[PDB]
Design an enzyme around this catalytic site. Structure first.
Site, short mmCIF file in Angstrom:
data_model
loop_
_atom_site.label_atom_id
_atom_site.label_comp_id
_atom_site.label_asym_id
_atom_site.label_seq_id
_atom_site.Cartn_x
_atom_site.Cartn_y
_atom_site.Cartn_z
N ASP A 181 -7.75 2.07 11.22
CA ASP A 181 -8.13 1.04 12.42
C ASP A 181 -7.59 -0.28 11.83
O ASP A 181 -7.73 -0.66 10.90
CB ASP A 181 -9.72 0.87 12.51
CG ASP A 181 -10.45 1.91 12.93
OD1 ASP A 181 -10.32 3.02 12.26
OD2 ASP A 181 -11.09 1.79 13.86
N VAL A 196 -5.02 -7.63 -5.85
CA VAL A 196 -3.45 -8.13 -5.32
C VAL A 196 -2.95 -9.43 -5.95
O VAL A 196 -3.64 -10.52 -5.61
CB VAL A 196 -3.25 -8.19 -3.82
CG1 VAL A 196 -1.69 -8.35 -3.41
CG2 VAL A 196 -3.76 -6.97 -2.96
#
EC number: 2.7.11.1
Length: 258
Positions: free
Chosen positions: A130, A21
């Site tokens: 999750d 990123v």
């Protein structure tokens, strides 16, 4: 030097196993975005292309003031570019580790934003992913944001639910509440509710369901925490159990649960 529109890709914000990123910056206005670069060859190698493809399509639809917004996806024959909202205040867990515990009123405020975000996901997220504490960030305005940027992997200087650590097949939304429980503890106390240098003793604690509540916390918030961190998922709080709570109702902006 890779460029996307007026955004020039520079510093590496976070790296995961699937990709990197890099933060891009508008050359004219100085507006910042977060670009998740996903190498086609690497993700075919890990055999997770389909999962990612569907995660993007799902995220396109999303619209929440406390989840990361995906602006557009650029698909070249070699890489995927996910242009997303930029966050400037780093991890929440790092802020707590650095600048101590959070003032009670602020602990509640951030937690209201986080639960709202998890509630949006449980509603719209097709296949459950999750909730992970390292994916809770903070923007320039000190608002909680949920993003998958992989900052915890970047280096400059409670672990899992009782049903997760027992190796059984678990219900995600239930584990998310337990995960929201530790975050609330982290917010209010500055430490983690289950913590021990000896590792096998750590899991014994998590499975035991017994933790320390400091004297500076009221019975009200304590009884919410005691309800969120129940080992047996059948007794564990739901989002609405939290929404109907004495302590949680206080100063709750009505937009977070419309």
């Amino acid at each position: 030097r890779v460029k996307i529109g007026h955004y020039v890709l520079g510093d590496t914000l976070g790296v995961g196993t699937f990709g990197k990123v890099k933060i891009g910056e508008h050359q004219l206005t100085g507006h910042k975005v977060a670009v998740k670069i996903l190498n086609r060859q690497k993700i075919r190698s890990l055999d997770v292309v389909g999962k990612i493809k569907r995660e993007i399509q799902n995220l396109k639809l999303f619209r929440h003031p406390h989840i990361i917004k995906l602006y557009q996806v650029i698909s070249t024959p070699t890489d995927f570019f996910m242009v997303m909202e930029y966050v400037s205040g780093g991890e929440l867990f790092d802020y707590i580790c650095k600048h101590g515990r959070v003032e009670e009123m602020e602990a509640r405020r951030l937690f209201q934003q986080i639960l709202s975000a998890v509630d949006y996901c449980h509603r719209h997220m097709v296949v459950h992913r999750d909730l992970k504490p390292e994916n809770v960030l903070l923007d320039a305005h000190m608002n909680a944001k949920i993003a998958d940027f992989g900052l915890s992997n970047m280096m400059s200087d409670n672990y899992a639910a009782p049903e997760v650590i027992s190796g059984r097949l678990y219900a995600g939304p239930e584990v998310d509440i337990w995960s929201c429980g530790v975050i609330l503890y982290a917010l209010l106390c500055g430490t983690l509710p289950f913590d021990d240098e000896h590792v096998p003793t750590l899991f014994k604690k998590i499975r035991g369901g017994v933790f320390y509540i400091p004297e500076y916390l009221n019975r009200s918030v304590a009884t919410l925490l005691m309800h969120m961190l129940q080992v047996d998922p059948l007794k564990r709080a739901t989002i609405k159990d939290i929404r109907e709570h004495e302590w949680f109702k206080q100063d709750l902006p009505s937009y977070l649960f419309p």
